[PDB]
Symmetry: C6
Subunit: 316 residues, 6 copies
């Protein structure tokens, strides 16, 4: 009848653990006034259950602090796990009035230990891989910003060579492991060099190197779509004029001074000089809001030249 006596023990344990709080049970355990203190199987089931509770509490605490990143390395999470296991076993046994040594309590508190450790290791390893991915992305930007932040070092004809060599090495050696993440790294380095001085030269020079990604081998200008390339180039050429306000003032004032000369024939030469100087800070031939400035200036200077030639007949 051992199958029945233990079966009734489970019911008595459930009644004990429902009808009382974690406090009243301790107050009544030393007073010998529980509902089934006499039956030993009832107390045994109550102990083996009140341990599986504390095990889940400490595991939930650790898993919850793992989910949102509070453990960076792996050894720190294991250390916190061990310390919390020990301290929590002790403190929950003390709170529930149970001896933290009685074998039955541990059969529940240690019930399924390897599988719970597997679960925690899996979740924390997922988070660690995620932060290592994010850290590679954030790190390979500082390494580039060592020789790509200087607006003078950028436009040298070797910066494209350094960038291509860096992607090639970090893709072959292992510095940039994920071939899928090389796209994010490339796009981030571009958007950086896009909205920074002189970036137009660097982009127009790097747009013809060779980079391997996902089996097929192509050219950078062909990796990202052609329309995406045109938009990126337009942004990289508007950068210098939306980042260094002084240059905007200089070119607008010089366009105005050229447009406002008395003899338009010299205004043509001044506008031509302005465009010749502006081609050296916007090499690629895309249309930017500045070529439109030159368009309006040439429009107005041509109208002025027409008017001045028509009014020159009155000098006859």
């Amino acid at each position: 009848k051992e199958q029945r006596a233990r079966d009734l023990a489970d019911e008595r344990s459930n009644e004990i653990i429902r009808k009382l709080t974690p406090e009243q049970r301790r107050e009544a355990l030393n007073n010998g006034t529980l509902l089934y203190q006499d039956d030993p199987y009832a107390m045994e089931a109550l102990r083996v259950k009140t341990g599986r509770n504390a095990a889940y509490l400490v595991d939930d605490d650790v898993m919850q602090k793992i989910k949102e990143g509070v453990f960076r390395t792996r050894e720190e999470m294991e250390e916190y796990r061990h310390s919390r296991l020990q301290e929590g076993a002790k403190v929950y046994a003390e709170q529930f009035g149970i001896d933290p040594e009685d074998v039955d309590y541990q059969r529940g508190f240690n019930g399924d230990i390897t599988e719970r450790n597997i679960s925690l290791y899996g979740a924390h390893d997922n988070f660690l891989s995620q932060q290592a991915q994010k850290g590679a992305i954030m790190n390979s930007r500082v390494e580039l910003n060592g020789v790509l932040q200087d607006p003078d070092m950028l436009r040298r004809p070797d910066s494209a060579d350094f960038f291509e060599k860096y992607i090639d090495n970090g893709l072959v050696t292992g510095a940039i492991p994920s071939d899928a993440q090389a796209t994010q790294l490339i796009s981030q380095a571009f958007s950086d060099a896009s909205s920074r001085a002189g970036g137009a030269d660097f982009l127009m020079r790097v747009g013809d190197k060779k980079v391997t990604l996902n089996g097929a081998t192509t050219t950078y200008r062909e990796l990202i779509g052609e329309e995406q390339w045109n938009a990126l180039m337009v942004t990289a050429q508007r950068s210098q004029f939306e980042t260094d306000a002084k240059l905007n003032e200089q070119y607008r004032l010089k366009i105005n001074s050229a447009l406002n000369q008395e003899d338009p024939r010299t205004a043509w030469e001044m506008l031509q000089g302005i465009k010749a100087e502006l081609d050296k800070v916007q090499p690629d031939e895309q249309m930017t809001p500045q070529r439109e400035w030159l368009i309006s200036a040439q429009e107005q200077v041509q109208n002025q030249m027409n008017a001045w030639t028509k009014a020159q007949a009155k000098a006859l």
Copy 2:
């Protein structure tokens, strides 16, 4: 044949619990007119089932009030759980006409108690972690707004030092636990200091400190993307002119007064003084809608100077 008599008991219990409402059964239990009142196993199965029902009802009530946050601490949820367990056992037993003490009713009402407590503790701990995350985010904004709300204390050269020290400490000690959430905290503090007076100085000064995030160590200007940094700086420099309307009026009226002098030579000096004063409320060199005001003013004053010099020849 014990395997069959109890098997028929389950069928009779199911017929009893389907063919009647929670009201008619009470009216008919004291009248001795149930469908299988004679068979004891039928009544036993009906009782052990009508308890697993009330258990799920009270558990669903508590879990439903846990899902959407009504319990802030953990002790309050446990207290409500215990009170509802007791009161619900009593009231559902009374409604279904069953004795709230008969052992069979409790074998169902207490059937799987530790696992249901595990489920509730897990859900409520998930919610508690979420609200603690949100509370850390909302709290580390008030602590910053103690020495970053004053538009005069902000532009001092030590505010950047205090901000860097705060992030470093709260990231090393534990005040800001989640390395992943430090990004949200940083972005929120920036967007705060972005659209507030004097914020341009604070941003341009903090953009060169050191902050560690996700293993790699970088500079704040390099943490968020360079184009994101330029957009943030443009917003932080348009802030003062989209928050204190009086300053907008002052600069627009002074630009107009400068532009409308009779001798443009003094208008050049007035516009230069305006730009010199404006550089002290917009330090970084990004292009804002105000440098465009100065551009238009210089354009028009140069046109006026050209016209006045051309009409000066008539004084000969």
Copy 3:
């Protein structure tokens, strides 16, 4: 061999229930021409199966009308459940030609009854919690619109006090249970008071009270982000000028009349009076499309004053 005879009964039942429609079986049951009418175990399996079918049909009907909200309270869903159980058992037994009393049919139709009731109670309680949430959100707007709809009662200096007291009470007592939903309630009440007359005063006064949310305690202006606060204030100050068209006409016509006086010196006083009156319907100092009206008016009146002073020399 009882394990085999019943095993063949299941196969015969499956063949019966596949090879016939719910109609032909009734026509052939009273004609004694089924495929295995002779074997009693075959008919028993066919009955215990054709009941589990109708049980699922009625349960699917009830669950489907529960999923999309057709039952508001809980007692109404239970009542509909009971009536549909009875009527559906009867009608499906009648359609399938089976006696609605034969014990075997009920062993299938009542097979797993408590678990299906658990499922329905869970789904309907989920929906009931959702509608109670939505109803609290929609209800705490009418209670506010009792003393916040009057454009005159709003701008009194006590409306902010009433709003703060209401949130505090409803957050402590229980009228507004979900601390997470207090954000939705606050944002909704604001957006209401935002786009309504006089709302600027109410917002600028409430932006310095104290509200507790998620453990940390802050000020309303700091709960929602500072840039969000500036946008909300701009909207609340453009409200009065995008809701009462008459006021727009009044201020635009008065600005025009001021700008079009013959002696600009009085136009300065008129514009100053206009701005002084306008500060009382837009207290906070944010930039709105109306301060821009005053900016353009002052620009043009200053140009006119300059022109009139320059042409005053001809009076000498």
Copy 4:
């Protein structure tokens, strides 16, 4: 050893069903050249397996035509199910060279029949509920468009009463069952009456009735947010001027004719008459792109009156 002989039968069946196509097996079944034709248990396992295949094929066909809606009612799906069951059993048995009557084939083809019928009924009932929801939404728009499409019947003071009575009845009786869907119905009827002639009157009149939704009772203007109400009213007042181009022409030409009179004093009266007539096609006081037309007209007529009064002094 019956546990082993059948165990080897499963392996032989798997080898038979892998090593051959549905065609070669038929060609080789009548030639007596299968791999294990001698063993009867092998053939029995092959038959009981080759039936569970065809069962899944026909079930997948029916479930796939159910998923994307091809069965509107429920009886049509059941009819197609039955016809396909019969025809598919026959045709798949014929293709696989198996007798469509041999009991073993049916033990597999009819293996789990009630559960598969449960699955199909559940999926098809889900789809039927979805289309009934969509049909209620689409139907309660035609019923409204019977007395809300006429641009003359709409602006009568009883249309709001009819709309409120309709929502109240259909929400109490059952014509509009889902309290959650009443929001969609209300918003759809509004957006209809929004962008249609005279809709402004209907909206401004219905915005003060009583509608119950989700326990709490409010007013229509308070059901949808106040800013949403202002946007909806602006759209409903721009409707008439973005739907009947003739009226746009009429008002623009009349504004121009008023603005272009020789004596502005009569132009004031003409513009006042225009605004008085326009208030009857835009009752609520929200700002629309048309009040802005009147604003510009009054601006220009005031400038013209000022100029004409200033030039009247030359008549002295």
Copy 5:
């Protein structure tokens, strides 16, 4: 002890399959130097396991080429499945050094064959249904573009009749099976006829037919929302002027020529003729960017007529 000897065989098999590569095992199988070559149960377990591996490899290959569509019909997928099964069994047995005939290898390679075939048939049938849906959508556009692409056949008064008859037939017969997809077909055919010449007539004529969808029966203008209908009509009337640039030139030049006549009285007649001709290429009364052209033209011609009448007094 048969339960233990085989139990140790599983462990030895696992050690064999972990401690070696798919290459070393073949090199060591013919050299008689495996770790447990002596024990027959070890080799048997190793064989029954190394088959379940190859089975999963070939199944994963086929399922992976099924997931992303490479098999259009069903017979092609079955053919590829069979060929790959045979060839893969042979080649994997050869690579792993196992006889491709030994019964134990097949007990693993053919282990669960019917269920894997069920899985593949289900996935491929899902994809086939998806492509049949997409193909019906793409096909019922070519059939319409046979009598709806001609800009002259479209505006005939029977095109609406053909479209309504087509939807009705294809919805009753079965050419357009999914009542849910009839919405996509209708919207696609509209958007086609929207941005194409003469489409305005076709839309304004079809907007009053009858189409049944989801139980309820409505009119096309009421199927899609009224505001959606107005937007669609505006697009369909701007189509002709955003697709055939020549017509844009013609109307703009003629508007200019009318506006620039010397006597405005004839300009009124010219503009009236232009509007009368334009009503035949934009029947419905919605406001388009072209009625605005006529509005500006009438505005300017009325101003010119006023000026010319005022200057006519000087002819007295």
Copy 6:
């Protein structure tokens, strides 16, 4: 009693593995001071468990480096798997102080090996299929950019033929396997040829070929929607004027020079020549921002001709 002695062994193993760290256990294993060193079953359970741990650690490492792509081919992943299995077994056994040969440790470390290999092969094959898809997409762009990048080779009348032949072949042979991905390939090749010089001719010529996709056969202009086709054509015709700024300058300056001649009669001929030349770089008749330039030019030249004809009467 063998069922109990091993049952206690599991509890003792769990206590051992909870109460100690991976370090203390090694220090105490050689000192003979574990908690249950005496019992052999306890040590056996501890060993069989401490192996299932290391197995999961190495499997999680490999699966985590597989999830985010670090293994391109399949043989490389298998090689890394094998090397890590060996090295990890050895190193984890050494760290946990267990003999890396004792049979019990391997019964846990090799516990479920074939299923874990199945899981890894499945995940890595999913990733490999994804990268092969992306590689086909990226590769069939370089192959096209060999004869579609030259702005002169593109506008030849055979480029459309080559493109159609390429899609047809790669869809029949297998170079472009996924019929679903042919849409992505087509759209990408178009968007490439869209925003590149001369692309208008290529698009307007390819828009009438034949391509089969998803059973139904249509024309390219009908594959993508007609409104999508019009938008794509507008973009392809604005490309040349938003990519080669020199051409923008040329046409704007020539339009200005034509508009500014003294005798408008020659300006008509100049504008007509400009439009005739512009039709050869924008063949399709869609409306672009350039036809609007010609519209404004013709508008202004017609106004000028009217003014000059009206002022010609003064020459009489």
